[PDB]
Design a protein around this motif. Sequence first.
Motif, PDB file in Angstrom:
ATOM      1  N   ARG A 730     -21.783 -16.769  27.822  1.00 21.75           N
ATOM      2  CA  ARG A 730     -22.234 -15.441  28.157  1.00 21.75           C
ATOM      3  C   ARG A 730     -23.118 -15.451  29.334  1.00 21.75           C
ATOM      4  N   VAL A 731     -23.501 -14.264  29.732  1.00 17.23           N
ATOM      5  CA  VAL A 731     -24.322 -14.133  30.897  1.00 17.23           C
ATOM      6  C   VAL A 731     -25.219 -12.939  30.693  1.00 17.23           C
ATOM      7  N   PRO A 732     -26.439 -13.026  31.267  1.00 18.61           N
ATOM      8  CA  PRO A 732     -27.299 -11.841  31.338  1.00 18.61           C
ATOM      9  C   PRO A 732     -26.454 -10.624  31.751  1.00 18.61           C
ATOM     10  N   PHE A 733     -26.016 -10.621  33.020  1.00 19.71           N
ATOM     11  CA  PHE A 733     -25.214  -9.539  33.568  1.00 19.71           C
ATOM     12  C   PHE A 733     -24.156 -10.073  34.427  1.00 19.71           C
ATOM     13  N   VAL A 734     -24.096  -9.550  35.640  1.00 21.74           N
ATOM     14  CA  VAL A 734     -23.061  -9.857  36.581  1.00 21.74           C
ATOM     15  C   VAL A 734     -23.635  -9.967  37.978  1.00 21.74           C
ATOM     16  N   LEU A 735     -23.766 -11.208  38.437  1.00 20.29           N
ATOM     17  CA  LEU A 735     -24.209 -11.487  39.781  1.00 20.29           C
ATOM     18  C   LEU A 735     -23.272 -12.547  40.348  1.00 20.29           C
ATOM     19  N   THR A 736     -21.986 -12.187  40.359  1.00 19.93           N
ATOM     20  CA  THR A 736     -20.841 -12.987  40.777  1.00 19.93           C
ATOM     21  C   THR A 736     -20.920 -13.557  42.200  1.00 19.93           C
ATOM     22  N   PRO A 737     -20.146 -14.638  42.482  1.00 14.45           N
ATOM     23  CA  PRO A 737     -20.156 -15.240  43.825  1.00 14.45           C
ATOM     24  C   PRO A 737     -19.746 -14.298  44.957  1.00 14.45           C
ATOM     25  N   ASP A 738     -18.820 -13.345  44.690  1.00 17.62           N
ATOM     26  CA  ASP A 738     -18.384 -12.333  45.661  1.00 17.62           C
ATOM     27  C   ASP A 738     -19.545 -11.395  46.023  1.00 17.62           C
ATOM     28  N   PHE A 739     -20.447 -11.121  45.052  1.00 22.39           N
ATOM     29  CA  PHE A 739     -21.635 -10.273  45.221  1.00 22.39           C
ATOM     30  C   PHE A 739     -22.643 -10.992  46.093  1.00 22.39           C
ATOM     31  N   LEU A 740     -22.933 -12.256  45.747  1.00 25.20           N
ATOM     32  CA  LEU A 740     -23.877 -13.119  46.453  1.00 25.20           C
ATOM     33  C   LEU A 740     -23.455 -13.449  47.865  1.00 25.20           C
ATOM     34  N   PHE A 741     -22.136 -13.501  48.110  1.00 27.67           N
ATOM     35  CA  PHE A 741     -21.580 -13.736  49.437  1.00 27.67           C
ATOM     36  C   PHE A 741     -21.872 -12.562  50.374  1.00 27.67           C
ATOM     37  N   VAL A 742     -21.970 -11.337  49.811  1.00 25.58           N
ATOM     38  CA  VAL A 742     -22.324 -10.110  50.535  1.00 25.58           C
ATOM     39  C   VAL A 742     -23.825 -10.179  50.864  1.00 25.58           C
ATOM     40  N   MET A 743     -24.573 -10.962  50.072  1.00 23.63           N
ATOM     41  CA  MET A 743     -26.009 -11.165  50.231  1.00 23.63           C
ATOM     42  C   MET A 743     -26.319 -12.438  51.045  1.00 23.63           C
ATOM     43  N   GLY A 744     -25.391 -12.820  51.933  1.00 20.93           N
ATOM     44  CA  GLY A 744     -25.493 -13.964  52.840  1.00 20.93           C
ATOM     45  C   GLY A 744     -25.682 -15.340  52.228  1.00 20.93           C
ATOM     46  N   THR A 745     -25.731 -15.423  50.884  1.00 26.26           N
ATOM     47  CA  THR A 745     -25.917 -16.671  50.141  1.00 26.26           C
ATOM     48  C   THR A 745     -24.563 -17.270  49.726  1.00 26.26           C
ATOM     49  N   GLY A 747     -23.216 -20.411  46.659  1.00 28.04           N
ATOM     50  CA  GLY A 747     -23.502 -21.326  45.555  1.00 28.04           C
ATOM     51  C   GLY A 747     -24.972 -21.442  45.198  1.00 28.04           C
ATOM     52  N   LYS A 748     -25.631 -22.499  45.723  1.00 27.77           N
ATOM     53  CA  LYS A 748     -27.058 -22.772  45.536  1.00 27.77           C
ATOM     54  C   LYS A 748     -27.808 -22.812  46.879  1.00 27.77           C
ATOM     55  N   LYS A 749     -27.782 -21.674  47.592  1.00 30.36           N
ATOM     56  CA  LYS A 749     -28.436 -21.475  48.888  1.00 30.36           C
ATOM     57  C   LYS A 749     -29.470 -20.333  48.738  1.00 30.36           C
ATOM     58  N   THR A 750     -29.805 -19.630  49.839  1.00 34.34           N
ATOM     59  CA  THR A 750     -30.746 -18.509  49.938  1.00 34.34           C
ATOM     60  C   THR A 750     -30.531 -17.864  51.310  1.00 34.34           C
ATOM     61  N   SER A 751     -30.922 -16.592  51.442  1.00 31.42           N
ATOM     62  CA  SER A 751     -30.838 -15.812  52.673  1.00 31.42           C
ATOM     63  C   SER A 751     -31.845 -14.646  52.609  1.00 31.42           C
ATOM     64  N   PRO A 752     -32.129 -13.934  53.735  1.00 36.26           N
ATOM     65  CA  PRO A 752     -33.086 -12.810  53.680  1.00 36.26           C
ATOM     66  C   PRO A 752     -32.701 -11.696  52.700  1.00 36.26           C
ATOM     67  N   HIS A 753     -31.400 -11.302  52.677  1.00 33.06           N
ATOM     68  CA  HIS A 753     -30.835 -10.258  51.810  1.00 33.06           C
ATOM     69  C   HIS A 753     -30.983 -10.591  50.326  1.00 33.06           C
ATOM     70  N   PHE A 754     -30.725 -11.859  49.953  1.00 31.87           N
ATOM     71  CA  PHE A 754     -30.842 -12.338  48.577  1.00 31.87           C
ATOM     72  C   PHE A 754     -32.293 -12.384  48.103  1.00 31.87           C
ATOM     73  N   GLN A 755     -33.223 -12.822  48.981  1.00 29.62           N
ATOM     74  CA  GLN A 755     -34.660 -12.878  48.683  1.00 29.62           C
ATOM     75  C   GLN A 755     -35.125 -11.456  48.408  1.00 29.62           C
ATOM     76  N   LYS A 756     -34.633 -10.510  49.238  1.00 27.49           N
ATOM     77  CA  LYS A 756     -34.857  -9.074  49.136  1.00 27.49           C
ATOM     78  C   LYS A 756     -34.317  -8.620  47.778  1.00 27.49           C
ATOM     79  N   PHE A 757     -33.063  -9.019  47.426  1.00 25.67           N
ATOM     80  CA  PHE A 757     -32.412  -8.730  46.144  1.00 25.67           C
ATOM     81  C   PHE A 757     -33.336  -9.052  44.966  1.00 25.67           C
ATOM     82  N   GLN A 758     -33.839 -10.305  44.908  1.00 24.47           N
ATOM     83  CA  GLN A 758     -34.748 -10.785  43.865  1.00 24.47           C
ATOM     84  C   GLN A 758     -36.051 -10.007  43.865  1.00 24.47           C
TER      85      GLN A 758
END
Length: 841
Positions: A730-745, A747-758
């Motif tokens: 199971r999973v908390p929710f849905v934060l799929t790789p296709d979603f994270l790719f839109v957030m410039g991240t 796998g196990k990386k980071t970007s400005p958009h993702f930091q903003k996301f968190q």
Amino acid sequence: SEESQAFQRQLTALIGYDVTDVSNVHDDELEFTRRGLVTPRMAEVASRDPKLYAMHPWVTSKPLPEYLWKKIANNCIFIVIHRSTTSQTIKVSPDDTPGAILQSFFTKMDFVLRVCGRDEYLVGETPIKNFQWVRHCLKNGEEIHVVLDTPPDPALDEVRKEVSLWDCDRKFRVKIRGIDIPVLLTVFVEANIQHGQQVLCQRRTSPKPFTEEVLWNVWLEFSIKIKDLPKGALLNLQIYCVQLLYYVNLLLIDHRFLLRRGEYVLHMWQISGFNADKLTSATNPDKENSMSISILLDNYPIALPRAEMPNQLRKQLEAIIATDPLNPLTAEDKELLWHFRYESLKHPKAYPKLFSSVKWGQQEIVAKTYQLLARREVWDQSALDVGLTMQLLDCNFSDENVRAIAVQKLESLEDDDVLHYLLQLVQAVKFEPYHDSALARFLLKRGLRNKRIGHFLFWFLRSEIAQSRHYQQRFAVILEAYLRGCGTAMLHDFTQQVQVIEMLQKVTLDIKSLSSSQVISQLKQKLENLQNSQLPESFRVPYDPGLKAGALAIEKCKVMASKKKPLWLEFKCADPTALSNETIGIIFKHGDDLRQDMLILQILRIMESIWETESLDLCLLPYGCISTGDKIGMIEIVKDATTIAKIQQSTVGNTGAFKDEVLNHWLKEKSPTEEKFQAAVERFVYSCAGYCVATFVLGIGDRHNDNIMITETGNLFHIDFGHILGNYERVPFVLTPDFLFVMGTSGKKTSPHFQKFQDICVKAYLALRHHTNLLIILFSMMLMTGMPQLTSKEDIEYIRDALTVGKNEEDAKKYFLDQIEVCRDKGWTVQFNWFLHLVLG
Ligand SMILES: COc1ccc(NC(=O)c2cccc3c(N)nc(C)nc23)cn1
């Protein structure tokens, strides 16, 4: 009269239930209530301004949010006025009163300022920044189009003219003549005396052989004096064999404060497979099948009429007041609240726990409790706390006076806030021991004073009448009372609407049966028939009363490729002043319980309203959804949207080989520029986080890929909430790789958009925790009134852990980011698993 005899037939077809009927009643409570409601109805009609009621301005007193202030050029807002065909764009200060905008038209170069395409007027004495429509334009960055025209006629709203119980130390007793099921173990009756889910006493019958008829003729002497019986006390009759099968309830004190005496034959409710239906005073209308019970109520008229405090005690008491709504109270805890009740009264937060500590099965206690209610200075003074107010209206409080203090606290809510809590205040009527209540009357005053509250009150009540036999009778009485005071104008809209919806549900159900290109034939064909001398010119969109739907764009209508066959209907706006040609898209569906979707969708609007108090916009899309009968109802079609799975099936096609890069392409493909693209990334990060948090709190986070959508503008949103709640690694929710790719991240990386996301998820998550008690009560109430069989208790408890109750902001923020990590760690397992399940079983 006779015109008033034809009138009752109109209302009955409007209500969807025949009130005047007396085939399923054992007393004059409903008739008593119908009569009782005449006064607050006529009282409110008489007190409402005919003009302001005709134009129903949709205002708000909440400070214009920060995000919309940072969305203004310079204390200057542009409005586009329209007349014949001639336009004009004027400058307006956020404090520009509407009426004074005409002295900026008869001075800048009798009537009212309506909106283009909508039945929304910009009337009344309020700053323009305070109109919902204005705030809606500003939010989504749009131009304010007004069609200056003649005010509606207030004459069109015109309404069609019109022994003391405390003296018997006698222990209560009830005679069980017997039961009889007209069709088929061992069997025993269980008689309980209840008050606010609190059981005062219990008795039983000798286990008799389970036959088509069972007699006892036994007297069940309870251990409660006749004088110790509280108003709102229920005789609960249950049949076991060991499992329960039926139950039925009888108020041991009627609407006239008289102790219930006589012979009763109660047609009992069956069990399937906690919830609100189990509390009903209503008997089963179906007698040909229903189990019956015969009882006797002795028929001899009996009517019902500061010092100091230690240190560790204050601290224990404070630790009690603090604790969330779902934390149980021990015998030690209760005995403490009671002894220190006067000190407990100084804290409005102590009221639910303090009133739960009351021994309601004792005359002297209730008396001291009423002595306690008179010294209510602190409560009556303090600012309104809806969460605290909602708690006194739940299943735990059967006392008339306790419940009334909560209702008086609601009296101060502006129309804007009644619309936020309307659905749940209406569901809270199921917790009322009596048909006539301060809450029943409060919903009546509010519906009659405002057309928007009244339009919604109508459908909410109508929805319940159609799919609930436990409460239709009671709800039918409140609806009838509403209809006799809303006016003949609205009484006409409600008629157009019912005609239209019933025609369309017929089409829904019929097409559902023929299950192909052949289906595409009949649909379009029937959509031609109804489009003649049957369906009127237009009608108000039930989920958007400001919209009038015109002709059916038959060319665009269709059946959907679902297990069930929902119609995809499309209408032209029935208003010329409409600044566009975009159709009105409605989905008609049978098969899913739409009441559950309404509840969640409504909780979503509250979470959006919570985020506004902290200048946050998580860009949620709580689309319109109106339940109309059993499994049936309508849904607002969000424009320019596709499912996340469809965007996957697009460049992978019915596989499961989920490409982490697809979605971001789809967005660029749809973006008119590289800039609108960034705004589409901007909107995505927000909407995604918004649903990520809101979905997690509600425990509906682990969703199917097909059950999630995005707009060609970046707006993400979940759908089919009545799918998981309706049957549900199971999973908390849905934060799929296709979603994270839109957030410039990746796998196990980071970007400005993702930091903003968190950082958005942290602000949002914590912002809801500042409203723990409120969310807990709403969630708790929702499960008891909308998610049947899905109550247990361990289900309610979920929300405590999700909101991480007791924890500091620092313990909480950490918990959420780790909750996010379960996604980064799961990647596609969950989605691929739902694919492995939801499409291949
Ligand atoms: C469980 O109740 C339901 C049922 C269906 C839906 N939604 C859909 O099936 C559905 C399908 C296609 C487009 C849309 C759409 N554009 N908007 C919305 C809300 N729902 C859609 C939501 N709740």
